[PDB]
Amino acid sequence: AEESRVPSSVSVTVAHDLLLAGHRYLDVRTPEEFSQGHACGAINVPYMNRGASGMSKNTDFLEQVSSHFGQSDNIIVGCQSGGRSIKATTDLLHAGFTGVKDIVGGYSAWAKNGLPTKA
């Protein structure tokens, strides 16, 4: 009974219900999105980011992380774009990108609010 690897696709609409549950939201709009910082109730990062997280930058750690862990292991991830990115995520899934939910959009919708929490 393992469930550390489960790739699923959904829309920010259904994820929103889960977002109310208070679950970590991973979003990757663009490396520059990181330079902007974080968000209020939304964690948007470029897949991998070096930090006190224990150093993890999409480069080789994938072999160590994909070894049995996912950068978003058990998380809700979503690319700024949908459909076109949905199949794109499948390419990353082959490299090891499961155990998380694939949401469509994210920052665009959260941006609609205008409440970005960050340093």
From Swiss-Prot:
Stretches assigned to the Rhodanese domain: 19-119
Broad EC category: transferase
Catalytic reaction equation(s): thiosulfate + hydrogen cyanide = thiocyanate + sulfite + 2 H(+)
Subunit structure: Monomer.
SMART domains: RHOD
Assigned keywords, A-Z: Chloroplast, Plastid, Transferase
Name of this chain's protein: Thiosulfate sulfurtransferase 16, chloroplastic
Function: Thought to act during the early stages of leaf senescence. Catalyzes the transfer of a sulfur ion from a donor to cyanide or to other thiol compounds. Substrate preference is thiosulfate > 3-mercaptopyruvate.
Location within or outside the cell: Plastid, Chloroplast
Any one GO molecular-function label of the UniProt entry: thiosulfate-cyanide sulfurtransferase activity
Keyword 4Fe-4S among UniProt keywords: no
EC number: 2.8.1.1
Protein's UniProt keywords contain DNA damage: no
Organism encoding this protein: Arabidopsis thaliana (Mouse-ear cress)
One GO location term (cellular component): cytosol
Residue positions binding substrate: 84
InterPro entries with a match to the protein in the record: Rhodanese-like_dom, Rhodanese-like_dom_sf, Thiosulfate_ST/Rhodanese-like
Pfam families: Rhodanese (PF00581)
Gene3D superfamilies: Rhodanese-like domain
Enzyme active site: 79 (cysteine persulfide intermediate)
